[PDB]
Amino acid sequence: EVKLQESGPGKLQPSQTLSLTCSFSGFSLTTSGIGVGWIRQPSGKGLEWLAHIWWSASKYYNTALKSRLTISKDTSNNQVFLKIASVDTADTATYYCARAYYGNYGGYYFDYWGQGTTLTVSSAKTTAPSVYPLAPVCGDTTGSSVTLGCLVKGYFPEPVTLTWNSGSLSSGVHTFPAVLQSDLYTLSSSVTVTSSTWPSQSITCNVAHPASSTKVDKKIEPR
Amino acid sequence: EVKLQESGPGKLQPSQTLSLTCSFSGFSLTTSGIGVGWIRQPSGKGLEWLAHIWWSASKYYNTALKSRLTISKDTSNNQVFLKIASVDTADTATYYCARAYYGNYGGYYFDYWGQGTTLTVSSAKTTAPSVYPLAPVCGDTTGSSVTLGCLVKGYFPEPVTLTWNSGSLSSGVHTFPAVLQSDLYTLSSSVTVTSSTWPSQSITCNVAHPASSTKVDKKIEPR
Amino acid sequence: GLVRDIRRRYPYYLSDITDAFSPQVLAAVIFIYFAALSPAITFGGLLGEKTRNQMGVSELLISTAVQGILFALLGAQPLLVVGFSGPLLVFEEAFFSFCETNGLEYIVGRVWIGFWLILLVVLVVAFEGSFLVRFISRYTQEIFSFLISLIFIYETFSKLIKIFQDHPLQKTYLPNTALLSLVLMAGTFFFAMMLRKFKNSSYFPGKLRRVIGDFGVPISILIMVLVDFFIQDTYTQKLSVPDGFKVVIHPLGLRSEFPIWMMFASALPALLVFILIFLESQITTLIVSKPERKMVKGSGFHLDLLLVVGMGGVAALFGMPWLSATTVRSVTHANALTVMIQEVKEQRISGLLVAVLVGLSILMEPILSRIPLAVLFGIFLYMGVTSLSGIQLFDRILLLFKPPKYHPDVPYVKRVKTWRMHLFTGIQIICLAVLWVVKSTPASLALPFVLILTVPLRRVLLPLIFRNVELQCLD
Amino acid sequence: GLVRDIRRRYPYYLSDITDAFSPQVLAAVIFIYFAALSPAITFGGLLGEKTRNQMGVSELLISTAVQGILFALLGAQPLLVVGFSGPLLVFEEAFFSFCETNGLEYIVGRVWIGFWLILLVVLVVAFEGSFLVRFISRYTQEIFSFLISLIFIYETFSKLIKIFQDHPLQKTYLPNTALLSLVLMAGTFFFAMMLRKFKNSSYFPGKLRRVIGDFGVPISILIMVLVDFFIQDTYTQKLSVPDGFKVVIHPLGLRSEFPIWMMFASALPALLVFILIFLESQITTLIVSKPERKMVKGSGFHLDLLLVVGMGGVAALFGMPWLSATTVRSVTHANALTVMIQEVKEQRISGLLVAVLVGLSILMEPILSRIPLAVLFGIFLYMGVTSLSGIQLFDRILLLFKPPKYHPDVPYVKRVKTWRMHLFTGIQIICLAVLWVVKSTPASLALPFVLILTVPLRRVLLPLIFRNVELQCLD
Amino acid sequence: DIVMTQSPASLAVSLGQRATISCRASQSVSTSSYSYMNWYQQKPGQPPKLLIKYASNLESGVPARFSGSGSGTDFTLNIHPLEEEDTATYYCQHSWEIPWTFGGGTKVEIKRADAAPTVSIFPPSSEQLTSGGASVVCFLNNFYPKDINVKWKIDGSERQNGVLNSWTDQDSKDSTYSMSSTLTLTKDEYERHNSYTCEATHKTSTSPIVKSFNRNEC
Amino acid sequence: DIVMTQSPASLAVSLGQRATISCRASQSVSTSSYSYMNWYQQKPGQPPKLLIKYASNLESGVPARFSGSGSGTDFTLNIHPLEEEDTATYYCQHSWEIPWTFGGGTKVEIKRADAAPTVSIFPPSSEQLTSGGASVVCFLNNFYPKDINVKWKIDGSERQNGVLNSWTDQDSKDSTYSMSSTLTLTKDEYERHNSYTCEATHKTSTSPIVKSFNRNEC
Ligand SMILES: *[C@H](S)Nc1ccc(CCc2ccc(N[C@@H](*)S)cc2S(=O)(=O)O)c(S(=O)(=O)O)c1
Ligand SMILES: *[C@H](S)Nc1ccc(CCc2ccc(N[C@H](*)S)cc2S(=O)(=O)O)c(S(=O)(=O)O)c1
DSSP, X not given: OOEEEEEOOSEEOTTSOEEEEEEEESSOTTSTTEEEEEEEEOTTSOOXXXXXXXXXXXXXXXXXXXXXXXXXXXXXXXXXXXXXXXXXXXXXXXXXXXXXXXXXXXXXXXXEEOOOEEEEEOSSOOBOOEEEEEOOOTTOOOOSEEEEEEEEEEEBSSOOEEEETTTTOOTTEEEEEEEESSSOEEEEEEEEEETTTTTTSOOEEEEEETTTTEEEEEEOOXX | OOEEEEXXXXXXXXXXXXXXEEEEESSOSSSTTEEEEEEEEOTTSOOEEEEEEETTOOEXXXXXXXXXXXXXXXXXXXXXXXXXXXXXXXXXXXXXXXXXXXXXTBSEEEEEEOOXXXXXXXXXXXXXXXXXXXXXXXXOOOOSEEEEEEEEEEEBSSOOXXXXXXXXXXXXXXXXXXXXXSSOEEXXXXXXXXXXXXXXXXXXXXXXXXXXXXXXXXXXXXX | OTHHHHHHHHHHHTTTTTTTOSHHHHHHHXXXXXHHHHHHHHHHHHHHHHTTTSSOHHHHHHHHHHHHHHHHHHOSOTTOXXXXXXXXXXXXXXXXXXXXXXXXXXXXXXXHHHHHHHHHHHHHHHTTGGGGGGGOOHHHHHHHHHHHHHHHHHHHHHHHXXXXXXXXXXXXXXXXXXXXXXXXXXXXXXXXXXXXXXXXXXXXXXXXXXXXXXXXXXXXXXXXXXXXXXXXXXOOOBOOOOSSOOOOOOTTOSSSOOOTTHHHHXXXXXXXHHHHHHHHHHXXXXXXXXXXXXXXXXXXXXXXXXHHXXXXXXXXXXXXXXXXXXXXXXXXXXXXXXOOOXXXXXXXXXXXXXXXXXXXXXXXHHHHTTSBHHHHHHHHXXXXXXHTXXXXXXXXXXXXXXXXXXXXXXXXXXXXXXXXXHHHHHHHHHHHHHHHHHXXXXXXXXXXXXXXXXXXXXXXXXXXXXXXXXXXXXX | OXXXXXXXXXXXXXXXXXXXXXXXXHHHHHHHHHHHHHHHHHHHHHHHHHTTTSSOHHHHHHHHXXXXXXXXXXXXXXXXXXXXXXXXXXXXXXXXXXHHHTTOOHHHHHHHHHHHHHHHHHHHHHTTOTXXXXXXXXXXXXXXXXXXXXXXXXXXXXXXHHHHHHSOXXXXXXXXXXXXXXXXXXXXXXXXXXXXXXXXXXXSOHHHHHHHHHTHHHHHHHHHHHHHHHOOSSOOOBOOOXXXXXXXXXXXXXXXXXXXXXXXXXXXXXXXHHHHHHHHHHHHHHHHTXXXXXXXXXXXXXXXXXXXXXXXXXXXXTTOOOOEEOHHHHHHHHSTTOOOOOOOOOOSHHHHHHHHHHHHHHHHHHHHTTSBHHHHHHHHHHHHHHHTSSOHHHHHHHHHHSOTTOOOSOHHHHHTTTTHHHHHHHHHHHHHHHHHHHTTSGGGXXXXXXXXXXXXXXXXXXXXXXXXTTGGGGO | OOOEEEEOXXXXXXXXXXXXXXXXXXXXXXXXXXXXXXXXXXXXXXXXXEXXXXXXXXXXXXXXXXXXEEETTXXXXXXXXXXXXXXXXXXXXXXXXXSOOBOOOEEEEEOOOXXXXXXXXXXXXXXXXXXXXXXXXXXXXXXXXXXOEEEEXXXXXXXXXXXXXXXXXXXXXXXXXXXXXXXXXXXXXXXHOOEEEEEEEETTEEEEEEEEEETTOO | OOOEEEEOSEEEEETTSOEEEEEEESSOOBOSSOBOEEEEEEOTTSOOEEEEETTTEEOTTOOTXXXXXXXXXEEEEEESSOOGGGOEEEEEEEOSSSSOOBOOOXXXXXXXXXXXXXXXXXXXXXXXXXXXXXXXXXXXXXXXXXXXXXXXXXTTEEEOTTEEOOBOOOOTTTOOEEEEEEEEEEHHHHHHOOEEEEEEEETTEEEEEEEEEETTOO
């Protein structure tokens, strides 16, 4: 079962040094032809390879970035690490750990990808989200189905995760991408069920923010 | 001006010897590659080659007929001759003098053709024709137009000529080709006018024959 | 006067059936069979196209087979192989065109030419004709057979380059066949040569090597045949034999009435033919039975003229082609059939067999159909260069291009003529030229005259040049 | 200790520029120019495809040219021609695959192999390396160069039949070219052979003949090139030179960070490469300068190892391929350049010129574009069979297929061994077999060991079979 | 000697349309390079005229709407566009060997609307009867196509003996044909029987067109 | 180092149709026998996934509606028949040399029936009001196409300031888009006014879809 798991600091002050860790399983970094490394995707952009390291300890680095990059490995504990010196706001990105494979005909392609880890470079201060339950308008002439909502404002930085009844309610969900306004994010979610379901059955917004380390539930009750 | 002419005896007695003569101009026989000869066409049939002779005095003859055929030539008087021995009724035909040209790629084709001569062979006695007027069936339910007829039977040899009112009535005439039956010919003619014309106006059959020097006029009257 | 030859050969005859049970014989038989059949076919076909089928392939096939058998049995020189020739084709075309222009029955006038041939021969044979042959020197024979060999090779190539024209190298849409034709030819030739050398070179032991080398030509043919066989996606011209034989003539004509004056005047073209067959066959018998080859037994001139041209007349009567004795064919049938110099095997059976075989080639059609022409073009080319062997004139032409440092068996000839030999050989060359331009025209039928005209005239105006010792050692 | 050779050759050196103004020289220059350029192109190309253009054509061209010039000038044996070889390619492929598997900067690890090469050479040279070479007998050399010549010939034929596969004989729609390639090759070869024989055979006078025959190969090439030229409607594969040169390396890496352990461990592959180049070049110098050829002057073992593999190391540093001294190429450069046995002309200029020429082939592109591969296939085949000459082993293999009736210069060897010689030669053959199966695998890099493993072991287990008089006369 | 088979025997072709005539040989008639087949045109009452030599080579002056083709044993004449004057009989002949032979000929005729015959019957004239003969005449006029059946019926039963017919050539104005039956008996036999009928059966109708009279009746 | 140019930047293609994507290389990226071009699929909020290796070799498990081709400098990805879940960004990358680089990516979007937004408005939660903020939220769900107008109206007069919108990525199941307007005022100002309206104007209808409430009213 080939797994890759990124971990980072979430956020980082400009000029400081970023240290990323990738833990993996389902393969050894002792095996010939295999390399492990990092590719980053800036928000709403494509992909940029950073660096990779093989069992040889030979390590390839992306030119222009080479100087700020140092990659290493702890083979015996299935880990590789990347350090980026004097980090700037242009380094705000999602950092993916990906396995490289030595192709049957030579060359390489990226076999397995971790789920990624989001990094934000900002002077600003970390702030937890306020979570607001959004039940329908008072006195509304209810129809065949009803729409509930959950508003998540005043947090920083990205990411935030939101679920309904903790995954158990998956259908008819629209979770909207965050938008930044004056160094604060706003995110929301819509969910639709049938009028017979709510307020009959309990619906609950669950929101979690790593950078502030909060897990919040908000039941949606009538006004 | 390549001219061929072919004289014969017109008619002959069966068992007799036919001598046909062909005179020409516009070319010598002394020329190499040139040949002169005879092809015959029986009434209403195709063509049968008989014989040819070249300056070499080499002479080609039609098989089966070979035995009865003799071809010769008088170069100095631009003539060639064909003789057919013990002639029968099957030799009645139109004889063609034909010159054959030696093709650029070898072989021969017939270059110039005489107008022909015509030969009749029969043991029959010259006989004048009987001319019979043919009016419609007595009591016939007459229509918009009427057909009159004229029968010319019992004559020999060809040719008999028939007119209507002496040429003056030319349209709508069908004179049928003669047919031989027991050494006698039978010919007929049809003429159609509008019922208003006949018997109102008179129609006369004129039949004229040379070999008997007989000219007939038979008016067509009602039965 | 002919009897001398019969007497000469008839005792050898009943030995010549036993003389034939060698393998070299067999190999020879196959060789000469192709060597005789291929031109029988090609010449037959041309002969047919020219005469619009009045005198065709099957006529020639029959004539060659039958005549071949007859001469094989009764001949004074059963090494001679009898067949149609280029000259004979030229004359048939001529006489056919003439006859038809003047509207004479071609096949009949032909018969009369034949009657005249039989007559002329009975005369010349009964009155020592071959006497004159004894006045035919080397200076003749060599100009002749070098001309022939050369023309032969040339023709062969001409055929090849014709294939190249029929199917030129280009793109779309015919293709890929010209080249392979060439390759096939080349390869067969190369193999023939190689195996010859193998037969004469050191490697391999005894009978294995000598027999393998004796079957050189048939082996080459077989190999190349297999090559074409296995190459299945590209067209190759192959030998075509008629599916079955198709087509006594009456001297007064068939569809004529053949003119009597002309059945006198046929004496003239028959004279010309007699001269053709005579010159060719006599010179060929000279070259085959020369002292330089070990065969100096069982051979005669008189019987062969009577036979060959007699056959000719009779054949003409049956609407068959008359034949002469071929040069190249006879020579390579002799070499076949030759041991190396060492005695040559003298059979009635080799010839008998090639004859019969040519006869049954009709039946053999399925076999002969797989044999690509190009292969026989190779064998041809080989025959050409092989034929070029015993010619002193050739040797000398070569010697001209050779430095004067190299010498002959006879010191006299080069030392007396370090420049002059090249002149004598030069007159040879210039004759060769003359005869090559004469033979170049449709005036070519004049040739057999020109050849004598050149040589025994030259061979009298030549003593104007050098002396009875000098010229003497040159032949 | 190398000095012995410098002292040997440097006086001859200032004489070897004057020695070079002959025409045979010039002909040799053209011949060897192609013989060196064709494998430069082909191997360069392969080398590019294998390494995905990290080590390409133009690199091999530069290296071959420069190294060629340098060694030509400073060598103990200026007849040696330095160029890429098959083994070297096998190793490039191997080391590339490995390096990239393990994510090593290929060209850098290459450089380190180079440093190690420089070291190994300094050691083996300063401490009497060539000593071991004096234990390399004929029984080695002959197995070696016969194996090579055989493989060479085989390879050439494989190229041709590849062309046949790329464009098989069929109908529609590619076509007509396989045949023409074959033809071109065959023709070129044939003409080479002919001209050679012409040079040694009687016809024609003096300088004309010897010079025409000395230019045998270039004349052949020219003729057939003209043939392809005038044949304008059919495609033929021709020599392709890159339009212009394209692609110091930092030993610590360019895109790495080249691991220190590997920049030690590159010592092993540098060992294997050193063994390859050593074996080849040394045995080659042995065969070129053997006593049987008149050249017994101006030649040395020590200088050449140092030069060749040194150049190699430096080249490795500059992103160039290292080269060894080629067998077939050198042998044929010697024969070129050889008079018949008679003295061989020993130049620095022949090599210098083929090198420079190889360099400028970039510029020569429009000329070389007109030269069809097939032609050079012919020339190759010719080189193959020519390379087969001075090998006694070959002579004997032959001698087996020959009747026992024929003898050698030395009655002793065949008389003592009418059966046994065939056995000795048979052991040769079985060795040949072994080496041909070893070299058959991608395990083939093992070979230079096997070659020793076979021979100087056999050459001790051989005195078990026959004696110090018996075996002694076989080399 | 070579036999040549032309087909069809008769061809009717609309104006400006294409007439195609064929000529098969009993053996080949052609070399590798030439075919020795000739074509002639014979208009009625004229000698034949040479159109084509060597299978496809047009004789001087011959219109380009004529064209010839073929080889071996199979040869073809084409007329396109057919004109009124091309109505003629066409003959092929070979020049491969003596005897030259001809094909049997193809009549090219103009095709028109299927038309019915106008049928008229005529008892013997009294003048003929006076002399002891008796001819019953039947005219079948202006019909198309030229093929037609004529049946004589005497008291119901068909009579076939003593009859003779004669066809008109295609009318140069209206492209119809006419034809004429004459049944001849003796006066005696004519007088023995009563009803005389001629029946004209023709493609134009399934029902025969019939005309009748009774002797000495009206 | 190698640069790769993908095109188009964006592609909209009807269901069951063919999407074709191209990727040009700054230098050749193939040998005589292989091409070293890879294709990846990245659905939104997911890591890239390998579809194609060696230009045309489908990686195991990848649907056959995906196919790759090309050589030299020019490469092509095909999706046929396009399905709903294939809405994604697609990336090419070379494996010719280090550094490995990527193309800029192509967003493939599904073209669908013009559908109307389902519009819902939401006054501030009382919990938010407690702390002095006031957000009026408006959800415009499951409409197409993705372009849509949102107007906020406060007592008849439109407001533009303090608003921020956010679009859903095309739904991989029903190919619609959704979006979220949030108007933020202070509690005070929110209380100064009475009627709050969000208006969704969209190609689907000429009449805006509008939802309203009055503050502290029901
Ligand atoms: C293949 S077997 N086809 C052949 C074609 C043509 C020839 C010979 C041509 C030739 C030979 C000899 C002579 N006269 C001197 S005896 C004339 C000619 S000619 O050019 O046609 O006029 C041959 S073959 O060499 O006779 O066999 C074979
Ligand atoms: C055309 S000039 N290109 C060539 C292709 C291949 C070869 C030989 C291949 C070869 C040569 C030598 C060896 N090792 C022993 S010395 C192995 C091989 S292998 O078959 O590829 O394994 C040549 S050339 O003969 O070297 O000239 C040229």
